[PDB]
């Protein structure tokens, strides 16, 4: 059918308007809710619609977060509307449709027994760090960074971060749930039960994605919460007493067998670009404050090729926009802008 609703622009207004869509198709279902694919009647533009059951006498965290965001590497909230079991309310997030995910692309190469071309690893990870730089500048932590939540336009190689259903604006002093993030990408402080963690848990998860892109498989495939730490210890060894305090000050373990870290150069295939391993070693640190900030990660030597005037996608096309930085995005370290924006990128 042609479905017509009254929906509020995600941008603001916020003044409601009639929005019509067709070709409705279920493309996702979970405990979170249902995701549809649809086609807008006046534009023809494809959209995704995320339908979530809403506690009617409460506000939606994901909505409040999504309304604040406007960034080329974050899925755009076009509209939102409510409906409508009798007295049940569903919130509908209308998002720009993006056909692929980093997960499905990486899985393709993985099943073909080959590694994703290094240029894409640079492209996707850099766009990931940008999206993180953006949301962290608001104090918003995603808390569910994984390849499945990274959307890809296969033609343009644009990456958009999605699924803010776990996201939270973190306030220091106010405790946060520890059992969060998909297991393989869960920061070690979370496993140790930290409630005072920071946005740096997203950087850990970003490091896991990077490593996965290099390995063709998850770096830490834990079968459970405890086994997740077992997996981490195989690479990083055991944390020092100081790293434990840094992760969770409320956790104490007076005695445990110390284990040395495995060399990063042996974690990855011999032909893994040494700069990718270097970046990875600065993201997958026990000490949360020792991890690179997303901006610092964007400025890393590994992304040097992206700042090269003559860089092209393997398909001949030019790369997506990479240097359109805003004051908000650069706010954690404003001077880094002269390194991040190379001379050919300026107006």
């Amino acid at each position: 059918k042609v479905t017509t609703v009254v929906a509020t622009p995600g941008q603001g207004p916020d003044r409601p308007q009639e929005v019509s869509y067709t070709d409705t198709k279920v493309i996702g279902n979970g405990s979170f809710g249902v995701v549809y694919q649809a086609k807008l009647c006046d534009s023809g533009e494809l959209v995704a619609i995320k339908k979530v059951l809403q506690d009617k006498r409460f506000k939606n965290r994901e909505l409040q977060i999504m309304r604040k965001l406007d960034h080329c590497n974050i899925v755009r909230l076009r509209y939102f509307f409510y409906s409508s079991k009798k007295d049940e309310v569903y919130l509908n997030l209308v998002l720009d449709y993006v056909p692929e995910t980093v997960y499905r692309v990486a899985r393709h190469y993985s099943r073909a027994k080959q590694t994703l071309p290094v240029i894409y690893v640079k492209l996707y990870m850099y766009q990931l760090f940008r999206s993180l730089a953006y949301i962290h500048s608001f104090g918003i932590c995603h808390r569910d960074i994984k390849p499945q939540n990274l959307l890809l336009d296969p033609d343009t190689a644009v990456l958009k971060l999605c699924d803010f259903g776990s996201a939270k604006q973190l306030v220091r002093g106010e405790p946060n749930v520890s059992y969060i993030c998909s297991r393989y990408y869960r920061a070690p402080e979370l496993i140790f039960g930290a409630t005072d963690y920071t946005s740096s848990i997203d950087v850990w998860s970003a490091g896991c994605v990077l490593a996965e892109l290099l390995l063709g498989q998850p770096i830490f495939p834990g079968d459970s919460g405890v086994d997740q730490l077992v997996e981490i210890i195989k690479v990083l060894g055991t944390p020092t007493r100081e790293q434990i305090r840094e992760m969770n000050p409320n956790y104490t373990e007076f005695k445990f067998p110390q284990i040395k870290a495995h060399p990063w150069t042996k974690v990855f295939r011999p032909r893994t670009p040494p700069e990718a391993i270097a970046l990875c070693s600065r993201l997958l640190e026990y000490t949360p404050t020792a991890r690179l900030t997303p901006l610092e990660a964007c400025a890393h030597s590994f992304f040097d090729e992206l700042r090269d005037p003559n860089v092209k996608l393997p398909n001949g096309r030019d790369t997506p926009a990479l240097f359109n930085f805003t004051t908000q995005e650069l706010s954690s370290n404003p001077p880094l802008a002269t390194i991040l924006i190379p001379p050919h990128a300026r107006i």
């Binding site: 059992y179 459970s224 919460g225 210890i233 373990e253 445990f256």
Partner: peptide, 24 residues
Amino acid sequence: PHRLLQQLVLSGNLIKEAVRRLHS
């Protein structure tokens, strides 16, 4: 390791047990 992880964290034996499970 949901109630198990909780126990490990509460009893202060998380690392000790993880190291054991390394197997070792």
